[PDB]
Amino acid sequence: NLNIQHSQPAINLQSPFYKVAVPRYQLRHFHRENFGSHIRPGTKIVFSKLKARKRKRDKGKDVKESFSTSQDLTIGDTAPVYLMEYSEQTPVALSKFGMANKLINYYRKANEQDTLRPKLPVGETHVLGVQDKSPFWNFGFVEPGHIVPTLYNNMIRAPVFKHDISGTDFLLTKSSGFGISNRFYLRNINHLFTVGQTFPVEEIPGPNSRKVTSMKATRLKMIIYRILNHNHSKAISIDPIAKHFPDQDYGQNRQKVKEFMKYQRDGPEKGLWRLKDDEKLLDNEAVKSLITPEQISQVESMSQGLQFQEDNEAYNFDSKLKSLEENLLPWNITKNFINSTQMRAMIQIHGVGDPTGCGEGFSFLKTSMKHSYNVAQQQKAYDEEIAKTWYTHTKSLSISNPFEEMTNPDEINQTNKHVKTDRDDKKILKIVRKKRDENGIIQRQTIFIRDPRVIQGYIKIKEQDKEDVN
Amino acid sequence: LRLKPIRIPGEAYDSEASDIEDDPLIESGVILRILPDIQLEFVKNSLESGDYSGISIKWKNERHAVVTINDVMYGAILVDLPTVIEVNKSVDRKNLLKTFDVSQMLLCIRPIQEEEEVYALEAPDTEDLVVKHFEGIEDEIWENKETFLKGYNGAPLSDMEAKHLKEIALKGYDYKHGISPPLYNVRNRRFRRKMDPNEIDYVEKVVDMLLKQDKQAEEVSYDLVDKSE
Ligand SMILES: [Zn+2]
C-alpha cells in the first residue's frame, strides 16, 4: 500500500525536532548544520559498538510500532542506512525527524497479459496498469515493461538513482540523549541514491496564507483540549495556557481563547472558561492529528523562501538576478506546477528557471498559452519538449562514471561562468568618519567600500534608518 | 551528570501532552572520506570485525581534525557539500525513516608527522564562495575574514590559531562535488547560481561592523562615487 505512516516522535511533533519557529540560522542554512561548531576543540573521538537490531523485533510490525521512541531512530544500530543525496540545491520540501518516505519501484505492464512483478534488491515494487496514469503526471513517465524507482511521500514525488558509494566514504555519526552523553559511531553506507527533481504533490503555503495563520489558533485548540482531558473539569483557567504564548499580553491571550472558550460569569465555575460545545473535545491521541509533520515542514520550506527573499533584497545588487528569485518563490512555483498538472496552466520547461543551469532539469516558471489547430501544434511541441527534458534529466542522474559518460565533467555552468560583480552605476562607497578620540584631537578617516554586496546592505539600512519621520 | 535539556515556553507543539520524552535522542553526522591507503583496508576490516580501537579522531579546530588510523596520522579538513543529504534507516527495505541531514564531509588529505601541519593543508576540489568571482576585491574581503574569525562559541583565538590565522581564515571550505557520481562538479555544472548562506553571513557582518563604527563616531557621511579614485 502507498499509504504513508510516520514514526511516533513524528506524529507527536516531539520537541526539539519540531518547533513553531526555527531560528533564522536554520532558515539561512536550510537542513545544513555546522558539525564543527558543536565539537569542543581537543575532543578525542573514539567509536562505540553498534546495538544489535533483532529481526524478530521489527518482524510484521507497523512503522509507529517499529519506531515508538527517538531511540528507535538511532544510527547506533545495525539497521541499514540509506543516503538520499538531493540533486537540487533547493528542493521543494525535505523531511523532518521521524518522518517516513516510501521507496517505490514503479513497474508498468507491457501488455494487459503481463504477469510480471519484478523485484529490485531494495524498495517496493508497485505495478502500473496499461491505462493507469503516471505517478509523475504529465511531466514524467514509466514506460511499459520498465521500472522507475521513486521517492514517495505526501509532500513530493521524485525519481531516484542508486549509485555505488566510493570505498573511501563512511558515515560518522554523533549521538547523545536518553540519559547518555555524546558518543560516536562509524558505519559503512548500505545504500546511496541521487534524488531527482522534486515534484510537489501539494502546494507550499504563502506568507499570508490562511493555512499558516490558522496554525496559531490550532496550536491553541491543541493545548486547551489537553488541559481539559487532564482535569476532566470542562471548566479551566486561562492562566496555564498563557505561559505557552509568552509574546501575548492579557488582552491578546483572552481574545485568542474566545475562538473556542466562553467565560463563566456566575456559578461555581465563575472566573473560569468552558469551551463552546460547537467545538467537540478530542481525546489526546486524536488531538495530535490536528497538525501533521508535513504541514510544519511545508511551512519551513515557505519560511526558507521568505528568508532568502529578504536576504536578497538587502544584499543583492543584481537587479536582474533579484527579480528572478522573486519569480522563483516556492509558494508561486509549486502552485503553478499543480495547475499544469491539472492542465490549468503551462511551464517554461527551460531557460532561467531551470535549477540546473544546464538543460538537465525542469523550469517551473509560468508561460502563456497554448486559435485551434495552432494550439494542437504548440501542445505537440510542449509534450515533446517535456519528454525530451525528462529523459535528459533521468539519463543525467544515471551516470555511473562521470568522465566517460559526461560531455565535459569540468565544464562550468552558464550562470557560474559569467557573473555580474559590479553595480549598475559601477560606483563604490565612500565613507568619511569624524571620531573625537585619543583624549584629544578629532580624528578623521576616509573609507572606501568596493564590495557591492556590502554597499547595498549599508545603504538599505541607512535608507530606512534615515526615516525617523511620521 | 546527565544534563536534561530545558524546553523554552512557546516553542513547542507537543506541550501539555503526556507522551513527552524528557531526554530525547539527538543525532548529527558527516561523511568521512579517507585516502585509498593501506589503512583504508584497515578501516574496512575494523568495521567488519567491530574493533574500533585502531581508529581515533582528534578535533583541533572548527574545520580541522586529525584522523589517526593504525598509528598513521592524517590531516583532515571539514568541507561543506553543495548538496543536502538525508540519512534514512529502514528495517523494511521499503519504508525509509528520516534521521538527520548531512551537508558536510570530513576530508582526509595527506599523512602528517605533527598535528599542527593540518592548518597549512589545502582541501582539494574546494573554493571560497565568499571570494569567488570577486577576486578583484579579495584584499578587502580577506582582512574582514581575519577580523571575524573566532574560536569555539565565539571564544578568542588560541595561540595556535592566531599563528596560522592567515591560512585558517582564508582557505576555501566549499566543496565542488556531491558524493554521488552524477553530481560530480554539481556546484559549477548542475547548479543554477544563487547567493551562498556563508556569503550572506559575511555580507551581513560587514554591514554591521560598518554601522557600529558609525555610532562610535560623531559626524558621519556616505556618498556613492565613481571608481576614481
Ligand atoms: Zn544528555
CB contact under 8 A, A19 and B11: yes
Given A291, A311, A339, the domain boundary residue is: A291
> B197-215 and A293-315 are packed helices; what angle lies between their axes, rounded to 10 degrees?
50
Which grid cell is B142? 580577506
Q: Are A365 and A351 in contact, with CB atoms under 8 Å apart?
A: yes
Q: How far apart are CA B206 and CA B198, in angstroms?
A: 13
**Residue A416: its chain B contacts at CB < 8 A?**
187-189, 191, 193
Q: Which residues of B touch A94 (CB under 8 A)?
A: 84, 86, 101
- A293, A10 contact by CB (below 8 A): yes
- Choosing from A262, A291, A320, the residue where a domain stops is A291
Q: Are A239 and A260 in contact (CB under 8 A)?
A: no
Strand partners, A83: A192, B87
Phi then psi for residue A274, to 5 deg, are -110, 145
A264 and A307, same structural domain? no
Residue A68 Ramachandran class (φ > 0 left, ψ -120 to 50 alpha, else beta): alpha
Contacts by A178-184, CB closer than 8 A, 24 or more apart: A178/A70, A178/A71, A178/B23, A178/B24, A178/B25, A179/B2, A179/B23, A180/B2, A181/B2, A183/A48, A183/A76, A184/A45, A184/A46, A184/A47, A184/A48, A184/B57
Prior bond to A16 cis, omega within 30?
yes
Query: What length is written for chain B?
Result: 229
**In terms of domains, do A218 and A202 share one?**
no
Phi then psi dihedrals of residue B194, to 5 deg: -130, 170
Q: Is B229 exposed, middle or buried (0-12, 13-18, 19+ CB in 10 A)?
A: exposed
Q: Domain boundary residue among A291, A320, A352?
A: A291
| Domains identified in chain A, total number | 2
Residue A201: CB atoms within 10 Å: 18
Give the residue from chain B lying closest to A353, CA to CA. B192
Contact call for B178 and A103, based on CB within 8 A:
no
Residues in chain A: 470
B85 and A CB contact within 8 Å = yes
Binding-face residues of B in 133-162 toward A, CB within 8 A: 133-134, 136-137, 140-141, 151-152, 158
Ligand 1 center–CA B23 separation, angstroms: 7
- Contact state of B86 with A449 under an 8 Å Cβ cutoff: no
Cα dist from B116 to A269, A355, B61, whole Å: 72, 41, 10
A298 and A390, same structural domain? yes
In this complex, do A413 and B191 lie within 8 Å of one another by their Cβ atoms? yes
In 3-state terms, what secondary structure has residue A248? coil
Q: Is residue A459 helix, strand or coil?
A: helix
Q: Do B97 and A98 touch (CB under 8 A)?
A: yes
Query: Residue B215, class by beta-carbon neighbours within 10 Å (0-12 exposed, 13-18 middle, 19+ buried)?
Result: exposed
Same domain assignment for residues A314 and A287? no
Question: A428-436 and A366-367 as β-strands: parallel, antiparallel, unpaired?
Answer: unpaired
Interatomic CA distance for residues A92 and A28, integer angstroms: 15
**How far is the alpha carbon of A149 from chain B, nearest alpha carbon, in Å?**
12
Do residues A116 and A239 share a domain? no
Minimum-distance CB partner of A28 among B59, B197, B213:
B197
Instruction: Inspect the interface and report whether the beta carbons of B30 and A172 lie closer than 8 Å.
Output: yes
Nearby residues for ligand 1 (ion, Cβ within 5 Å): B 2
Give the integer Cα–Cα distance in Å for A296 and A152: 18
Spell out the SS3 assignment of chain B: CCCCCCCCCCCECCCCCCCCCCCCCEEEEEEEECCCCCCHHHHHHHHHHCCCCCEEEEECCCCEEEEEECCEEEEEEEEEEEEEEEEEECCCCCEEEEEEEEEEEEEEEEECCCHHHHCCCCCCCEECCCCCCCHHHHHHHHHHHHHHCCCHHHCCCCHHHHHCHHHHHHCCCEECCCCCHHHCCCCCCCCCCCCCHHHHHHHHHHHHHHHHHHHCCCEEEEEEECCCC
Strand pairing of A100-108 and A147-152? antiparallel
Please compute, for residue A114, the number of CA atoms within 13 A of its CA located in the half-sphere on the CB side: 16
Dihedral-angle region of residue A267 (phi above 0 means left; psi in -120 to 50 means alpha; beta otherwise): left
* Residue (of A100, A146, A127) closest to B94 by Cα position: A100
| Same domain as A302, residue A263 | no
Amino acid letter at A381? A
φ, ψ dihedrals at A192, nearest 5°: -130, 125
- CB atoms under 10 Å from CB of A164, counted, come to 11
Residue A38 in grid coordinates: 558543536
C-alpha B179, offset from chain centre: 16
Record: contact A122-B93, CB cut-off 8 A: yes
Please indicate, yes or no, whether residues A219 and A326 belong to a single structural domain of this protein. no
CA–CA separation, B187 and B86 (whole Å) = 18
Cα–Cα distance for residue pair A335/A218, rounded to 1 Å: 24
Q: For residues A221 and A262, what is the distance between their CA atoms, to the nearest angstrom?
A: 13
Joined grid coordinates for residue B24: 530525547
Cα distances (Å, whole numbers) of residue A202 to A2, A21, A68, A363, B4: 16, 22, 27, 18, 38
DSSP string, A121-149: SSSEEEEEPSSPPPTTTTS----BT-EEE
**Whether A317 and A267 share a structural domain:** no
Residues from chain B that touch A103, judged by Cβ atoms under 8 A, are 90, 93-96
Residue A247: give the domain boundaries: 208-291
Distance from Cα A176 to the centre of ligand 1, integer Å: 6
Q: How far apart are CA A179 and CA B164, in angstroms?
A: 39
Map residue A315 onto helix, strand or coil.
Answer: helix
Best mutation target, B95, B107, B135, to test chain A (most A CBs within 10 A): B95
Contacts of B32 in chain A (CB under 8 A): 169-172, 186
Q: Smallest Cα–Cα separation from A6: which of A206, A170, A153? A: A153
Asked whether the beta carbons of residue B61 and residue A172 sit closer than 8 angstroms, the reply is no
Q: Which helix (H) or strand (E) holds A172?
A: strand A169-177
CB contact under 8 A, A246 and B9: yes
- Cβ atoms of residues B126 and B173 within 8 Å: yes
Cα gap A392→A59, rounded to integer Å: 40
Sign of the four-CA dihedral A315, A319, A325, A329: positive
Q: Do A175 and B7 touch (CB under 8 A)?
A: no
Cβ-defined contact of B222 to A431 (cutoff 8 Å): yes
In sequence order, the β-bridge partners of residue B75 are B66, B110
Distance from CA of B165 to the nearest CA of A (A): 16
> Which residue on chain A is closest to B202 by alpha carbon?
A454
3-state secondary structure of A225: helix
Contacts of A397 in chain B (CB under 8 A): 182
Residue B18: exposed, middle, or buried by beta-carbon count in 10 A (0-12, 13-18, 19+)?
exposed
Cell numbers describing residue A291:
497538525
How far apart, in whole angstroms, are the C-alpha atoms of residue A340 and residue A370? 12
| Residues A48 and A156 occupy one common structural domain | yes
| Per-position b or e across B68-79, b if 16+ CB within 10 A of its CB | bbeeebbbbbbb
Verify that A145 and A275 share a domain, yes or no.
Answer: no
Closest CA of chain B from A335, distance in Å:
21
Q: Measuring CA to CA, how many Å separate A292 from each of A63, A465, B14?
A: 16, 41, 12
All residues of chain B having their beta carbon less than 8 Å from the beta carbon of residue A48 are 52
Strand partners, A77: A51
Q: Which residue's entry shows cell 570505498?
A: A167
Q: Which of A20, A193, A433 sits opposite B13 (nearest CB)?
A: A20
Same structural domain for residues A92 and A234?
no
Q: Do A74 and A51 form a contact (C-beta atoms < 8 A)? A: yes
Residue with cell 485551434: A372
The answer to whether residues A318 and A351 belong to one domain is yes
Closest CA to B17 of A73, A288, A257, A21: A288
Number of CB pairs, chain A paired with chain B, less than 8 A apart? 458
Query: What's the CA-to-centroid distance between B21 and ligand 1, angstroms?
Result: 12
- Nearest CB among B28, B88, B185 relative to A101 is that of B88
Contacts of B12 in chain A (CB under 8 A): 13, 15, 18-20
d(CA A449, CA A428): 6
Distance CA A333, CA A205 (A): 11
CA distance A209 to A215: 10
DSSP conformation letters of A398-448: T-SSHHHHSS-TT---HHHHS---S-SS--EEEEEEEEE-TTSSEEEEEEE
Return phi, psi of residue A402, to 5°. Answer: -50, -55
Indicate the residue of A163, A429, A459 with minimum beta-carbon distance to B180.
A163
Residue of B nearest to A120 (CA): B93
Classify A63 as helix, strand or coil: helix
Give A170's contacts in chain B (Cβ within 8 Å): 31-34, 43, 47
Q: Do A31 and B25 touch (CB under 8 A)?
A: no
Tell which phi-psi region holds residue A96, choosing left (phi > 0), alpha (psi between -120 and 50) or beta.
beta
Burial (0-12, 13-18, 19+ Cβ within 10 Å), A116? exposed
